[PDB]
Design an enzyme around this catalytic site. Structure first.
Site, PDB file in Angstrom:
ATOM      1  N   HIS A  89      33.417  84.697 -22.288  1.00  0.00           N
ATOM      2  CA  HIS A  89      32.532  85.033 -20.936  1.00  0.00           C
ATOM      3  C   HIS A  89      31.148  85.233 -21.503  1.00  0.00           C
ATOM      4  CE1 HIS A  89      36.274  85.840 -18.976  1.00  0.00           C
ATOM      5  NE2 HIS A  89      36.645  87.151 -19.494  1.00  0.00           N
TER       6      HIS A  89
ATOM      7  N   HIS B 292      24.093  92.199 -24.033  1.00  0.00           N
ATOM      8  CA  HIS B 292      24.816  90.959 -24.024  1.00  0.00           C
ATOM      9  C   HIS B 292      23.936  89.998 -22.826  1.00  0.00           C
ATOM     10  CE1 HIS B 292      26.497  92.761 -20.113  1.00  0.00           C
ATOM     11  NE2 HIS B 292      26.279  91.871 -19.739  1.00  0.00           N
TER      12      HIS B 292
ATOM     13  N   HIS C  26      23.271  86.438 -20.313  1.00  0.00           N
ATOM     14  CA  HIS C  26      23.795  85.493 -19.194  1.00  0.00           C
ATOM     15  C   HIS C  26      22.900  84.479 -19.039  1.00  0.00           C
ATOM     16  CE1 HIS C  26      26.799  88.523 -17.485  1.00  0.00           C
ATOM     17  NE2 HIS C  26      25.650  89.250 -17.941  1.00  0.00           N
TER      18      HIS C  26
ATOM     19  N   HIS D 191      21.460  92.209 -20.493  1.00  0.00           N
ATOM     20  CA  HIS D 191      21.732  93.415 -20.010  1.00  0.00           C
ATOM     21  C   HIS D 191      21.980  94.366 -20.978  1.00  0.00           C
ATOM     22  CE1 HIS D 191      23.257  90.813 -16.408  1.00  0.00           C
ATOM     23  NE2 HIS D 191      22.014  91.287 -16.090  1.00  0.00           N
TER      24      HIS D 191
ATOM     25  N   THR E 215      28.449  92.877 -12.560  1.00  0.00           N
ATOM     26  CA  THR E 215      28.396  91.575 -12.296  1.00  0.00           C
ATOM     27  C   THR E 215      29.737  90.920 -12.865  1.00  0.00           C
ATOM     28  OG1 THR E 215      27.220  90.609 -14.419  1.00  0.00           O
ATOM     29  CG2 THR E 215      25.769  91.578 -12.801  1.00  0.00           C
ATOM     30  N   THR E 216      30.481  91.278 -13.736  1.00  0.00           N
ATOM     31  CA  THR E 216      31.602  90.937 -13.931  1.00  0.00           C
ATOM     32  C   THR E 216      32.991  91.626 -13.483  1.00  0.00           C
ATOM     33  OG1 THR E 216      31.716  91.981 -16.437  1.00  0.00           O
ATOM     34  CG2 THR E 216      31.045  89.662 -16.227  1.00  0.00           C
TER      35      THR E 216
END
Ligand code: TE3
Ligand code: ZN
Length: 222
Positions: A62, A88, A90, A107, A173-174
């Site tokens: 992910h 992490h 995105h 984030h 957001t996950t």
């Protein structure tokens, strides 16, 4: 249960994948968001207390995550100290400014003494290679697995000297899209180059950005 950004497992469907992910669809303060209008307010200044730490890097399908086993990378705002558990990325960005989507977003995820989550986000423009992120890119597992990075790492250097931020309440957001997450999004952009975006994506498998969720009743402070 499997979830992701393409096919049946995609964010439009997270709610229906299981009982636990239901908030993904029925939340009213979901992240990310597109930041259009705002209220000018006198926000409390961020204090940054990041230092070299022994970290380890993980690919879980992910995202590419840098985890902090030991505390002591903290962040103080309005009297409360928030401990960094991890940061992490995105690609592309999850949150937006005025319709606009950034090559990558990071984030920084904290918890205070009370298990109250706070995410600090950094948006990256397209530009020069990111020299500070090379340490982590250079041993990024290109398939699922956790290595343990042997050079201490200074998140210090991933944050800017200028720390103005948008402030709103939201969510993971996950999945399970839990709410009650403080979001602080940094007005000063960092930068990465083409190679870096594609490499993260190569590794993670796809674009990993949940679509912008309606603000609803929420006000973004600036
Ligand atoms: N994509 S993102 O930046 O919003 C996320 N960041 N962290 C996530 N999950 C965790 O950090 C674990 C932990 C578990 C329970 C307390 C809060 C969060 S999603
Ligand atoms: Zn995230």
């Amino acid at each position: 249960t499997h979830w992701g950004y393409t096919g049946h497992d995609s964010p439009e469907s997270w709610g229906n994948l299981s009982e636990e992910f239901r908030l993904c669809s029925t939340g009213k303060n979901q992240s990310p968001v597109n930041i259009t209008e705002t209220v000018s307010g006198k926000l409390p200044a961020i204090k940054v207390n990041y230092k070299p730490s022994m970290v380890d890097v993980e690919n879980n399908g992910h995202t590419i995550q840098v985890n902090y086993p030991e505390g002591g990378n903290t962040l103080t705002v309005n009297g409360r100290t928030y401990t960094l558990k991890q940061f992490h990325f995105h690609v592309p960005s999850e949150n937006q400014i005025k319709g606009r989507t950034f090559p990558m977003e990071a984030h920084f995820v904290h918890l205070d003494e009370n298990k109250q989550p706070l995410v600090l986000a950094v948006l990256y423009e397209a530009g020069k290679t990111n020299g500070r992120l090379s340490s982590i890119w250079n041993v990024m597992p290109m398939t699922a697995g956790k290595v343990k990075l042997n050079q201490p790492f200074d998140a210090s250097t991933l944050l800017p000297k200028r720390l103005k931020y948008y402030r709103f309440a939201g969510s993971l957001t996950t999945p399970p899209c839990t709410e009650g997450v403080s979001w602080l999004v940094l007005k000063t952009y960092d930068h990465i180059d083409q190679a870096q975006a594609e490499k993260f994506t190569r590794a993670v498998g796809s674009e990993n950005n949940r679509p912008v969720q309606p603000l609803n009743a929420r006000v973004v402070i600036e």
